[PDB]
Enzyme design. Structure first.
Site, PDB file in Angstrom:
ATOM      1  N   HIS A 310       0.870  -1.206   0.000  1.00 54.16           N
ATOM      2  CA  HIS A 310       0.000   0.000   0.000  1.00 54.16           C
ATOM      3  C   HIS A 310       0.902   1.251   0.000  1.00 54.16           C
ATOM      4  O   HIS A 310       1.791   1.404   0.876  1.00 54.16           O
ATOM      5  CB  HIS A 310      -0.877   0.021   1.261  1.00 54.16           C
ATOM      6  CG  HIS A 310      -1.832   1.146   1.310  1.00 54.16           C
ATOM      7  ND1 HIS A 310      -3.152   1.009   0.963  1.00 54.16           N
ATOM      8  CD2 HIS A 310      -1.583   2.465   1.495  1.00 54.16           C
ATOM      9  CE1 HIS A 310      -3.707   2.208   1.025  1.00 54.16           C
ATOM     10  NE2 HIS A 310      -2.759   3.115   1.276  1.00 54.16           N
ATOM     11  N   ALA A 311       0.688   2.135  -0.987  1.00 62.76           N
ATOM     12  CA  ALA A 311       1.625   3.202  -1.267  1.00 62.76           C
ATOM     13  C   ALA A 311       1.851   4.131  -0.062  1.00 62.76           C
ATOM     14  O   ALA A 311       0.901   4.507   0.631  1.00 62.76           O
ATOM     15  CB  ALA A 311       1.120   4.039  -2.422  1.00 62.76           C
ATOM     16  N   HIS A 340       0.127  12.094  -5.438  1.00 64.12           N
ATOM     17  CA  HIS A 340      -0.258  12.150  -4.020  1.00 64.12           C
ATOM     18  C   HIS A 340       0.992  11.927  -3.130  1.00 64.12           C
ATOM     19  O   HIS A 340       1.285  12.711  -2.214  1.00 64.12           O
ATOM     20  CB  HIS A 340      -1.292  11.083  -3.746  1.00 64.12           C
ATOM     21  CG  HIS A 340      -1.715  11.046  -2.322  1.00 64.12           C
ATOM     22  ND1 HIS A 340      -2.708  11.829  -1.803  1.00 64.12           N
ATOM     23  CD2 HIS A 340      -1.187  10.337  -1.304  1.00 64.12           C
ATOM     24  CE1 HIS A 340      -2.758  11.584  -0.478  1.00 64.12           C
ATOM     25  NE2 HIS A 340      -1.839  10.706  -0.144  1.00 64.12           N
ATOM     26  N   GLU A 341       1.695  10.816  -3.379  1.00 61.17           N
ATOM     27  CA  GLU A 341       2.870  10.467  -2.601  1.00 61.17           C
ATOM     28  C   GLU A 341       3.968  11.504  -2.743  1.00 61.17           C
ATOM     29  O   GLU A 341       4.682  11.779  -1.781  1.00 61.17           O
ATOM     30  CB  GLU A 341       3.341   9.061  -2.931  1.00 61.17           C
ATOM     31  CG  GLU A 341       2.289   8.017  -2.622  1.00 61.17           C
ATOM     32  CD  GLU A 341       1.877   7.893  -1.178  1.00 61.17           C
ATOM     33  OE1 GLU A 341       2.634   8.339  -0.308  1.00 61.17           O
ATOM     34  OE2 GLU A 341       0.730   7.351  -0.953  1.00 61.17           O
ATOM     35  N   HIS A 344       3.663  14.370  -0.333  1.00 65.90           N
ATOM     36  CA  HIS A 344       4.224  14.146   0.973  1.00 65.90           C
ATOM     37  C   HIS A 344       5.728  14.387   1.010  1.00 65.90           C
ATOM     38  O   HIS A 344       6.241  15.001   1.945  1.00 65.90           O
ATOM     39  CB  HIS A 344       3.921  12.716   1.438  1.00 65.90           C
ATOM     40  CG  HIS A 344       2.495  12.421   1.713  1.00 65.90           C
ATOM     41  ND1 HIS A 344       1.782  13.162   2.610  1.00 65.90           N
ATOM     42  CD2 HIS A 344       1.699  11.335   1.380  1.00 65.90           C
ATOM     43  CE1 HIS A 344       0.575  12.607   2.745  1.00 65.90           C
ATOM     44  NE2 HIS A 344       0.499  11.508   2.009  1.00 65.90           N
ATOM     45  N   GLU A 368      -1.980  15.562   3.142  1.00 65.43           N
ATOM     46  CA  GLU A 368      -2.666  14.776   2.151  1.00 65.43           C
ATOM     47  C   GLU A 368      -3.051  15.592   0.922  1.00 65.43           C
ATOM     48  O   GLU A 368      -3.112  15.025  -0.164  1.00 65.43           O
ATOM     49  CB  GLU A 368      -3.966  14.152   2.725  1.00 65.43           C
ATOM     50  CG  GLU A 368      -3.674  13.275   3.925  1.00 65.43           C
ATOM     51  CD  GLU A 368      -2.680  12.141   3.660  1.00 65.43           C
ATOM     52  OE1 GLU A 368      -2.626  11.708   2.456  1.00 65.43           O
ATOM     53  OE2 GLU A 368      -1.978  11.745   4.597  1.00 65.43           O
ATOM     54  N   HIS A 466      -6.244   1.186   6.205  1.00 59.57           N
ATOM     55  CA  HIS A 466      -5.985   2.109   7.308  1.00 59.57           C
ATOM     56  C   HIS A 466      -6.523   1.596   8.640  1.00 59.57           C
ATOM     57  O   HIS A 466      -6.073   2.074   9.686  1.00 59.57           O
ATOM     58  CB  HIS A 466      -6.695   3.439   6.986  1.00 59.57           C
ATOM     59  CG  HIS A 466      -6.136   4.006   5.708  1.00 59.57           C
ATOM     60  ND1 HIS A 466      -6.456   3.455   4.472  1.00 59.57           N
ATOM     61  CD2 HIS A 466      -5.373   5.094   5.490  1.00 59.57           C
ATOM     62  CE1 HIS A 466      -5.839   4.156   3.530  1.00 59.57           C
ATOM     63  NE2 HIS A 466      -5.155   5.181   4.100  1.00 59.57           N
ATOM     64  N   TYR A 476      -8.331  12.558   4.921  1.00 61.70           N
ATOM     65  CA  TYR A 476      -8.610  12.464   3.486  1.00 61.70           C
ATOM     66  C   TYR A 476      -9.884  13.228   3.145  1.00 61.70           C
ATOM     67  O   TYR A 476     -10.042  13.756   2.061  1.00 61.70           O
ATOM     68  CB  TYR A 476      -8.714  11.007   3.027  1.00 61.70           C
ATOM     69  CG  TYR A 476      -7.413  10.258   3.351  1.00 61.70           C
ATOM     70  CD1 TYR A 476      -6.276  10.450   2.598  1.00 61.70           C
ATOM     71  CD2 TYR A 476      -7.395   9.272   4.311  1.00 61.70           C
ATOM     72  CE1 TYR A 476      -5.132   9.747   2.860  1.00 61.70           C
ATOM     73  CE2 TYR A 476      -6.215   8.592   4.628  1.00 61.70           C
ATOM     74  CZ  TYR A 476      -5.075   8.822   3.879  1.00 61.70           C
ATOM     75  OH  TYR A 476      -3.942   8.102   4.148  1.00 61.70           O
TER      76      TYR A 476
HETATM   77  C1  LIG Z   1      -2.440   5.835  -1.319  1.00 65.91           C
HETATM   78  C2  LIG Z   1      -2.568   6.482   0.053  1.00 65.91           C
HETATM   79  N1  LIG Z   1      -1.660   5.747   1.013  1.00 65.91           N
HETATM   80  C3  LIG Z   1      -1.563   6.428   2.297  1.00 65.91           C
HETATM   81  C4  LIG Z   1      -0.603   5.694   3.246  1.00 65.91           C
HETATM   82  C5  LIG Z   1      -0.658   6.269   4.623  1.00 65.91           C
HETATM   83  C6  LIG Z   1       0.261   5.694   5.676  1.00 65.91           C
HETATM   84  C7  LIG Z   1       0.502   6.410   6.844  1.00 65.91           C
HETATM   85  C8  LIG Z   1       1.280   5.855   7.847  1.00 65.91           C
HETATM   86  C9  LIG Z   1       1.816   4.585   7.690  1.00 65.91           C
HETATM   87  C10 LIG Z   1       1.602   3.883   6.528  1.00 65.91           C
HETATM   88  C11 LIG Z   1       0.792   4.407   5.533  1.00 65.91           C
HETATM   89  C12 LIG Z   1      -1.131   7.901   2.123  1.00 65.91           C
HETATM   90  O1  LIG Z   1      -0.129   8.121   1.398  1.00 65.91           O
HETATM   91  O2  LIG Z   1      -1.828   8.824   2.649  1.00 65.91           O
HETATM   92  C13 LIG Z   1      -4.020   6.415   0.524  1.00 65.91           C
HETATM   93  O3  LIG Z   1      -4.371   5.555   1.323  1.00 65.91           O
HETATM   94  N2  LIG Z   1      -4.897   7.362   0.098  1.00 65.91           N
HETATM   95  C14 LIG Z   1      -4.570   8.495  -0.793  1.00 65.91           C
HETATM   96  C15 LIG Z   1      -5.543   8.530  -1.938  1.00 65.91           C
HETATM   97  C16 LIG Z   1      -5.145   8.623  -3.251  1.00 65.91           C
HETATM   98  C17 LIG Z   1      -6.102   8.582  -4.274  1.00 65.91           C
HETATM   99  C18 LIG Z   1      -7.430   8.408  -4.004  1.00 65.91           C
HETATM  100  C19 LIG Z   1      -7.827   8.244  -2.689  1.00 65.91           C
HETATM  101  C20 LIG Z   1      -6.885   8.318  -1.638  1.00 65.91           C
HETATM  102  C21 LIG Z   1      -7.227   8.143  -0.176  1.00 65.91           C
HETATM  103  C22 LIG Z   1      -6.280   7.135   0.506  1.00 65.91           C
HETATM  104  C23 LIG Z   1      -6.790   5.734   0.121  1.00 65.91           C
HETATM  105  O4  LIG Z   1      -6.365   5.205  -0.909  1.00 65.91           O
HETATM  106  O5  LIG Z   1      -7.642   5.183   0.912  1.00 65.91           O
HETATM  107 NA    NA Z   2      -4.418  -1.464   0.202  1.00 68.18          NA
HETATM  108 ZN   LIG Z   3      -1.225  10.533   1.811  1.00 65.94          ZN
END
Ligand SMILES: C[C@H](N[C@@H](CCc1ccccc1)C(=O)O)C(=O)N1Cc2ccccc2C[C@H]1C(=O)O
Ligand code: NA
Ligand SMILES: [Zn+2]
Ligand SMILES: *[C@@H]1O[C@H](CO[C@@H]2O[C@@H](C)[C@@H](O)[C@@H](O)[C@@H]2O)[C@@H](O[C@@H]2O[C@H](CO)[C@@H](O[C@@H]3O[C@H](CO[C@H]4O[C@H](CO)[C@@H](O)[C@H](O[C@H]5O[C@H](CO)[C@@H](O)[C@H](O)[C@@H]5O)[C@@H]4O)[C@@H](O)[C@H](O)[C@@H]3O)[C@H](O)[C@H]2NC(C)=O)[C@H](O)[C@H]1NC(C)=O
Ligand SMILES: [Cl-]
Ligand SMILES: [Cl-]
Length: 570
Positions: A310-311, A340-341, A344, A368, A466, A476
């Protein structure tokens, strides 16, 4: 006394950078190579950071922040008073660390198998099925199977997790873990403010829902879609029905008006991240360092290693080492994730000279939002044409529809995840009711229903990353509102006139400078100050998102009225 506090935070900063750098290393190594050896090293480094947190947090509680004059030092000390999990006694800390590792590992290695056939992982296999299959039964297999194998397997850990995270929160002065999480916004009125934002998006969401429901009725048949009821949760193109644009082909407003192009034209994970880097530097923002290209994991390993796909974006707390870990697929959805990444990473770079205690976004939603703002411009037909991935009012509505399927559909989903968790944490939802209360919110907010009745032992929340990873979600929801406020402001700064959805900020140094000024603040100032720096006003507001989607709201209302649609569901 003021001088002792000052000395205090200088020692905390030097030592924290060392210890957190070591922890991050170990955490990365586990996340990019799940093994009994990297796990052991991780659970050990957990104890080292805990010991450090305990030491400096204990010392920080010795100060009366009510007496401290320097507002930076006061703020830092106040924050270091929160030990998080390090407040727990040793037995409980050990049990908690283990539960968290076990949850995240269970999620990341779960697979769904055909008998005497292949076994699919979430990324990329089940993701792909949910995005591309148009067959009810095949989507049902993936949807149900993922819940059976990931969700049900998290349930054994979740009650103890809740006990221990709540115990830690109480030991740090909060009433429960949800209270602690909400505190990150420093906004007493948060729950009411979020509720008002959600209400403002309801016309658009109910109209989109009814329109999509109609289209699904056309494809999946009258016997499977109730035009006055909720939508089956496996038909929206995404495992969680959180974003819907993978079913664009089923709902296209104007048929007569990118994955193939990306593949054929030779796009790769590394090219996708290069594109994103290029977009940041086009705004005069920072490039990622050479080290990022050397150390990041930008595609799923082929070498055998099990990984957390998971990204995510990683700061190693030394001002130099920043990494992404993503199992990237070559498609536009994943290009949006890559941006998105990279937002950060950009934040990490921008606040790298602050004391570590202030190395966070103004609030978590700001962290975010940054990458998503750039992706709004990437997604425009104009910009996709500039990348050669693509070759009228009809085109406009089609584009707004594609955008809405992701951005508007996500609003109720993102709202509901922590409404569920806050109620688990505050004790309102007990373990016997976890799954029922999840579905009552899926209905209430999203107007979805599960295609197969849920049964004893199900724990569908556990099938969403999550949840087992203990990552807060309301960030988000905040992000998806404020990103449009930022887009509106940066488009104004860049001199764009005319419909906001036509804006592309590519190459705007004025847009870049607005964002940089706010990012550089870190967590040093109340978040409204950062909001005002970017936008000229201090509040969260749905007005910008509504403005963006106005032509679609108008179109959807006319279209739904012509079909006599009954918005909503029972
Ligand atoms: C891809 C992203 N991954 C998290 C990973 C967050 C994380 C925090 C602490 C420890 C490990 C992981 C993030 O980077 O915030 C994501 O979880 N969303 C963005 C996103 C992108 C496109 C569309 C929707 C979302 C919301 C969310 C998701 O996919 O649920
Ligand atoms: Na996932
Ligand atoms: Zn994020
Ligand atoms: C209340 O106190 C704050 C904080 O004061 C600082 O921190 C405390 C603990 C003491 O150690 C004190 O001596 C420090 O000054 C006061 O705010 C500071 O005010 C100064 C002077 O105006 C201001 O100076 C600027 O610093 C900017 C950024 O600096 C960092 O980056 C440099 C280049 O990269 C590098 O030399 C240092 O970088 C490290 O610093 C981090 C913290 O230790 C560290 O974690 C990280 O790894 C960094 O690499 C440097 O710190 C620079 O752009 C400008 O030129 C200025 O010289 C500080 O920015 C400011 N600090 C903060 C956090 O706000 C405040 O003025 C005071 N109030 C009153 C009324 O007295
Ligand atoms: Cl679900
Ligand atoms: Cl959050």
């Amino acid at each position: 006394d003021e001088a002792e506090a000052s000395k205090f935070v200088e020692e905390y900063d030097r030592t924290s950078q060392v210890v957190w750098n070591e922890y991050a290393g170990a955490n990365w190594n586990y996340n990019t190579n799940i093994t009994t050896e990297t796990s052991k090293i991780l659970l050990q480094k957990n104890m080292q950071i805990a010991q450090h947190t305990l030491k400096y947090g204990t010392q920080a509680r010795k100060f009366d922040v009510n007496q401290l004059q320097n507002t930076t030092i006061k703020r830092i000390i106040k924050k270091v008073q929160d030990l998080e999990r390090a407040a727990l006694p040793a037995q409980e800390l050990e049990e908690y660390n283990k539960i968290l590792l076990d949850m995240e590992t269970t999620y990341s290695v779960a697979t769904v198998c055909h008998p005497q056939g292949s076994c699919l992982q979430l990324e990329p296999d089940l993701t792909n099925v949910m995005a591309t299959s148009r067959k009810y039964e095949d989507l049902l297999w993936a949807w149900e199977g993922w819940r059976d194998k990931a969700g049900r397997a998290i349930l054994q850990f979740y009650p103890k997790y809740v006990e221990l995270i709540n115990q830690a929160a109480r030991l740090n002065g909060y009433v429960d873990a949800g209270d602690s999480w909400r505190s990150m916004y420093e906004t007493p009125s948060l729950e009411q403010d979020l509720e008002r934002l959600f209400q403002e998006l309801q016309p658009l969401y109910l109209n989109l829902h009814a329109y999509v429901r109609r289209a699904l009725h056309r494809h999946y048949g009258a016997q499977h879609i109730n035009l006055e009821g909720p939508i089956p949760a496996h038909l929206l193109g995404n495992m969680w029905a959180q974003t819907w644009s993978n079913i664009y082909d089923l709902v296209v407003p104007f048929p007569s008006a990118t994955t193939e192009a990306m593949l054929k034209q030779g796009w790769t994970p590394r090219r996708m991240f290069k594109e994103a880097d290029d977009f940041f530097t086009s705004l005069g923002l920072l490039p990622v360092p050479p080290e990022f290209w050397q150390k990041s994991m930008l595609e799923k390993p082929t070498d055998g290693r099990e990984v957390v796909c998971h990204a995510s974006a990683w700061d190693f707390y030394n001002g130099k080492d920043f990494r992404i870990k993503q199992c990237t697929t070559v498609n536009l959805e994943d290009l949006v994730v890559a941006h998105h990444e990279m937002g950060h990473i950009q934040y990490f770079m921008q606040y790298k000279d602050l004391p570590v205690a202030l190395r966070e976004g103004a609030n978590p939603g700001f962290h975010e939002a940054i990458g998503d703002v750039l992706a709004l411009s990437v997604s425009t037909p104009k910009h996709l044409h500039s990348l050669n991935l693509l070759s009228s009012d009809e085109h406009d509505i089609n584009f707004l529809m594609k955008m809405a399927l992701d951005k508007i559909a996500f609003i109720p989903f993102s709202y509901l995840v922590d409404q569920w968790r806050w109620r688990v944490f505050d004790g309102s939802i007990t373990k016997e009711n976890y799954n029922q209360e999840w579905w009552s919110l899926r209905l209430k907010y999203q107007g979805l229903c599960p295609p197969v009745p849920r049964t004893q032992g199900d724990f569908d929340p556990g099938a969403k990353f999550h949840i087992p990873s203990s990552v807060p979600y309301i960030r988000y929801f905040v992000s998806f509102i404020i990103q449009f406020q930022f887009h509106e402001a940066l488009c104004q700064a860049a001199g764009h006139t005319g419909p906001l959805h036509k804006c592309d900020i590519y190459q705007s140094k004025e847009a870049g400078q607005r964002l940089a000024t706010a990012m550089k603040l870190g967590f040093s100032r109340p978040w409204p100050e950062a909001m005002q720096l970017i936008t000229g006003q201090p509040q969260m507001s749905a007005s910008a998102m509504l403005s963006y989607f106005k032509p679609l709201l108008d179109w959807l209302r006319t279209e739904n009225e012509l079909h006599g649609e009954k918005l909503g569901w029972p």
